[PDB]
Design an enzyme around this catalytic site. Structure first.
Site, PDB file in Angstrom:
ATOM      1  CD  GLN B  32      -1.472  -1.066   3.626  1.00 29.32           C
ATOM      2  OE1 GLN B  32      -2.736  -1.144   3.415  1.00 29.32           O
ATOM      3  NE2 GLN B  32      -0.941  -1.637   4.450  1.00 29.32           N
ATOM      4  CD  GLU B 107       0.065  -4.846   9.258  1.00 30.06           C
ATOM      5  OE1 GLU B 107      -0.566  -4.389  10.327  1.00 30.06           O
ATOM      6  OE2 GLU B 107      -0.088  -4.653   7.930  1.00 30.06           O
ATOM      7  CG  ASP B 138      -4.129 -12.321   3.288  1.00 32.76           C
ATOM      8  OD1 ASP B 138      -4.915 -12.238   4.050  1.00 32.76           O
ATOM      9  OD2 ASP B 138      -4.219 -12.005   2.078  1.00 32.76           O
ATOM     10  CG  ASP B 156      -6.549  -2.089  14.372  1.00 35.24           C
ATOM     11  OD1 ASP B 156      -7.122  -1.538  13.529  1.00 35.24           O
ATOM     12  OD2 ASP B 156      -5.762  -1.719  14.863  1.00 35.24           O
ATOM     13  CB  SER B 157      -9.006  -4.739   9.065  1.00 40.19           C
ATOM     14  OG  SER B 157     -10.161  -4.483   9.372  1.00 40.19           O
ATOM     15  CB  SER B 158      -6.808  -0.944   6.336  1.00 41.58           C
ATOM     16  OG  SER B 158      -6.287  -2.161   5.571  1.00 41.58           O
ATOM     17  CG  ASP B 159     -11.660   1.733   5.745  1.00 44.33           C
ATOM     18  OD1 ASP B 159     -12.165   1.322   6.786  1.00 44.33           O
ATOM     19  OD2 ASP B 159     -11.046   2.815   5.575  1.00 44.33           O
TER      20      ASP B 159
HETATM   21  C1  LIG Z   1      -3.099   0.159  10.754  1.00 49.48           C
HETATM   22  S1  LIG Z   1      -4.164  -0.827  11.484  1.00 49.48           S
HETATM   23  C2  LIG Z   1      -4.696  -1.652   9.923  1.00 49.48           C
HETATM   24  C3  LIG Z   1      -3.732  -2.699   9.551  1.00 49.48           C
HETATM   25  O1  LIG Z   1      -4.373  -3.981   8.779  1.00 49.48           O
HETATM   26  C4  LIG Z   1      -3.283  -4.336   7.984  1.00 49.48           C
HETATM   27  N1  LIG Z   1      -3.803  -5.349   6.891  1.00 49.48           N
HETATM   28  C5  LIG Z   1      -4.657  -5.328   5.884  1.00 49.48           C
HETATM   29  N2  LIG Z   1      -5.088  -5.894   5.277  1.00 49.48           N
HETATM   30  C6  LIG Z   1      -4.591  -7.006   6.029  1.00 49.48           C
HETATM   31  C7  LIG Z   1      -4.600  -8.472   5.992  1.00 49.48           C
HETATM   32  N3  LIG Z   1      -5.235  -9.114   4.939  1.00 49.48           N
HETATM   33  N4  LIG Z   1      -3.735  -9.084   6.934  1.00 49.48           N
HETATM   34  C8  LIG Z   1      -3.128  -8.709   7.719  1.00 49.48           C
HETATM   35  N5  LIG Z   1      -3.086  -7.301   7.881  1.00 49.48           N
HETATM   36  C9  LIG Z   1      -3.640  -6.570   7.186  1.00 49.48           C
HETATM   37  C10 LIG Z   1      -2.698  -2.929   7.237  1.00 49.48           C
HETATM   38  O2  LIG Z   1      -1.496  -3.134   6.474  1.00 49.48           O
HETATM   39  C11 LIG Z   1      -2.802  -2.175   8.595  1.00 49.48           C
HETATM   40  O3  LIG Z   1      -1.426  -2.446   9.048  1.00 49.48           O
END
Ligand SMILES: CSC[C@H]1O[C@@H](n2cnc3c(N)ncnc32)[C@H](O)[C@@H]1O
Ligand SMILES: CSC[C@H]1O[C@@H](n2cnc3c(N)ncnc32)[C@H](O)[C@@H]1O
Lengths: 281, 281
Positions: B32, B107, B138, B156-159
């Site tokens: 990203q 992460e 992943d 605690d994911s991103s969108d």
């Molecule tokens: C900052 S908190 C959100 C975190 O979710 C992480 N993230 C997004 N998608 C995934 C995934 N499939 N697995 C693990 N972490 C993820 C992002 O890279 C970010 O660091």
């Protein structure tokens, strides 16, 4: 298309924006700059002195929580005052209570009322009701001179920069105490806990110098800065405003969209840092 | 000075902005676009794919509510997983619990972790703790393959646009069910009730196909779109997550800034229109 942006010294360093579908009306009134536009996703928007007062999409949260919190506590309110609220949303909500006999509204800027009747018909519809009486005046003078006392007073002001300046001081809080029945209640827009804590503390202070019980609740609404706004809740009786005494089951309340019996009490459970902040006031 | 603006097709027609004091770091990582800047009023800000993940001023609200809600229910959690959360804020909060023996964090993007250790030391400090073990993967694969089961899992994911894409579907929700102890709990970032209701409904649906109890709570935080974000709360036992079983009185919790015993339950009292929306799921 173009964007409308809400900047202000009241919230330095941040801004919220809405895309404009079209501009509907602008003017300078005797008191403020008025702007109404249709936004692309929040419907029509009413702006005064560059600050969003309401939007069609979300105004129900602020109007229902400001109205139904005190109205569900007050045992049978007969005579109610709205300060500010020229758009009429508080009135819309009050008119749902059949026991109410009279609703006075004291708004300084008639342009707001008439703009609202023209461009916001679902918010302004309660001006039709026979019980509603309008006064064009600085509420600050209007409360100095009014002969009646009220069961409930609801202070739906704009922010402290502008004509609402006179509504955010100690003397204004005396005027309210006196214009209320002995067991009366005031609720007043009191800003965001995420950035206005000095103000919140001042406001609470003022209220405490007179009321035996001052509580603060919070309302999630996206189009006010930081996504929330607070209600300063004042009580002359010692049991305060955090719990309803009735439930809105009349068919006139079927339509409500935010307020309910449970989330009335919930709105008073504040973040730790805020409680911590307002302890020794 | 210049402004940073958060636009997105996930919230068409609105935008929130923060004034930039200075830009600290930009890069494209394997997954990203990463940006870190010092804002003028919200301190340092971490942005991924143009979307704010956290700010120093307010991150405590989201990290404390996501952590302490489930941790105060779960009776004595030993082994906890964080998905996402590379900044480490959830870890900071978990490390406050002495009974915890192991904390895994999965992460996908190591750049986030290292950026966080460099530029956000008060948020990333929990990586020091001997109990913390890091996996770069992943989470969607990591949960397919992990041999252990967990007391608590915190997503605690991103969108959903970006690498978090794989975390917002039914199959992902099975993987969590299986990786949890028989009386385990998951909490997961589940977006804003002011604009994401279709998603919220989908998410809830997914969870219900497996968990006997799915609740949704709301967190006031100014720097996420619309000023709030939701926690999808999943339980395998029938009594759910709305009430704590303990109180945070150890000296390690003295510092908390949002979460408390009362506002744990409050966060589950949602606006009428939302309840109405999620009834027949
Ligand atoms: C900052 S908190 C959100 C975190 O979710 C992480 N993230 C997004 N998608 C995934 C995934 N499939 N697995 C693990 N972490 C993820 C992002 O890279 C970010 O660091
Ligand atoms: C739209 S709701 C806020 C309303 O408060 C009104 N207002 C601001 N200051 C005062 C005041 N001193 N007295 C009465 N209404 C006011 C504004 O003109 C606006 O219509």
């Amino acid at each position: 298309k173009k964007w409308f942006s809400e900047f202000s010294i009241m919230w330095p360093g941040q801004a919220f924006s809405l895309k404009i579908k079209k501009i509907l009306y602008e003017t300078k009134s005797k008191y403020q700059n008025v702007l109404v536009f249709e936004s692309t996703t929040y419907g029509k928007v009413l702006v005064l002195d560059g600050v969003i007062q309401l939007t069609e999409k979300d105004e129900f949260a602020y109007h229902e929580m400001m109205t139904h919190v005190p109205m569900t506590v007050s045992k049978e309110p007969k005579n109610v005052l709205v300060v500010g609220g020229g758009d009429g949303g508080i009135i819309r909500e009050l008119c749902k209570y059949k026991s109410v006999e009279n609703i006075d509204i004291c708004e300084i800027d008639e342009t707001v009322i008439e703009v609202s009747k023209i461009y916001f018909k679902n918010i302004s519809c309660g001006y039709e009701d026979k019980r509603v009486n309008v006064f064009i005046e600085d509420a600050s003078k209007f409360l100095e001179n009014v002969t009646n006392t009220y069961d409930v007073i609801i202070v739906d002001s704009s922010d402290p920069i502008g004509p609402a300046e006179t509504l955010f001081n100690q003397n204004f809080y005396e005027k309210i105490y006196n214009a209320l029945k002995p067991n009366g209640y005031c609720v007043a827009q009191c800003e965001s806990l995420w950035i206005h804590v000095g103000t919140i503390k001042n406001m609470i202070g003022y209220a405490k110098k007179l009321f035996k019980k001052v509580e603060y609740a919070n309302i999630s609404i996206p189009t006010y800065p930081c996504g929330c706004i607070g209600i300063l809740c004042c009580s002359k009786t010692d049991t305060g405003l955090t719990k309803p005494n009735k439930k809105l089951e009349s068919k006139e309340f079927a339509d409500l969209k935010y307020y309910n019996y449970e989330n009335h009490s919930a709105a008073f459970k504040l973040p730790a840092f805020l409680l911590k902040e307002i302890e020794n006031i």
